[PDB]
Design a binder for this molecule. Structure first.
Ligand SMILES: Cc1ccc(S(=O)(=O)CNC(=O)[C@H](Nc2ccc3c(c2)CNC3)c2cc(Cl)cc3[nH]ncc23)cc1
Lengths: 156, 39
């Protein structure tokens, strides 16, 4: 099937009509998405099949066809772009300055942008267009808004 | 059964809509991969 680099929608014909369950990044022949989007199940790309290769529920990440390729990281200082791909809507770049998730194991960047659950897996970019993480795993703050972590995997 | 559809190139767009605040939150991450606000 299609192995061209770029952002993709993860769809399902298991519910009413075609439903967008998430988003993913195709890079170096490897599809990268969030674990809660596919639950580790196989994906289809036209005629071809994509089989899971690596996955981890705690990191909430999964890769298809090969090991995790995305290794860029937020510099802690500059603005980033969320290439948001919302259900039924065109891909759209939203520039923002990330905040911080302070944890017992370290600090992680966070993007405070609200989008439908089907936007999970949309990439976060640096000024060079490098994927510094995926949007879609976060929390709801006391005012009801959504703040997502900048979730990045490890490249072996 | 899930399938993928291309939605675009991964490129930085100069003059994109700048929005969103940058909050500093105390969070915890559990074994199920779910975040929670620590208070
Ligand atoms: C009723 C309820 C309770 C809690 C929340 S939350 O604040 O924790 C939002 N959680 C998400 O990050 C979620 N994705 C998700 C789903 C399952 C799992 C994982 C992550 C990782 N482990 C399993 C998501 C992402 C996005 Cl982009 C838009 C969204 N809207 N609602 C959800 C949600 C929201 C709602």
């Amino acid at each position: 099937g299609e192995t061209t680099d770029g952002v993709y929608r993860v769809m399902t014909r298991r519910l009413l009509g075609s439903t967008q369950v998430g988003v993913g990044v195709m890079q170096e022949g490897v599809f990268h998405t969030m674990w809660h989007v596919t639950k580790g199940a196989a994906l289809r790309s036209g005629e071809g099949r994509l089989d899971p290769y690596w996955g981890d529920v705690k990191q909430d990440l999964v890769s298809y066809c090969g090991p995790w390729k995305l290794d860029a990281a937020w510099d802690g200082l500059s603005e980033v772009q969320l290439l948001a791909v919302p259900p039924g809507e065109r891909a759209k770049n939203i520039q923002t300055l990330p905040g911080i998730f302070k944890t017992k194991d370290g600090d992680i960047g966070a993007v405070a942008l609200d989008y439908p659950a089907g936007t999970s897996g949309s990439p976060i970019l640096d000024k060079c267009g490098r994927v510094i993480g995926l949007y879609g795993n976060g929390v709801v703050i006391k005012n009801g808004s959504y703040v997502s972590a900048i979730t990045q995997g490890k490249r072996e | 059964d899930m399938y993928i559809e291309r939605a675009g190139d991964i490129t930085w767009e100069k003059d994109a809509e700048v929005t969103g605040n940058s909050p500093r939150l105390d969070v915890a991450l559990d074994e199920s991969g779910d975040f929670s606000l620590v208070e």
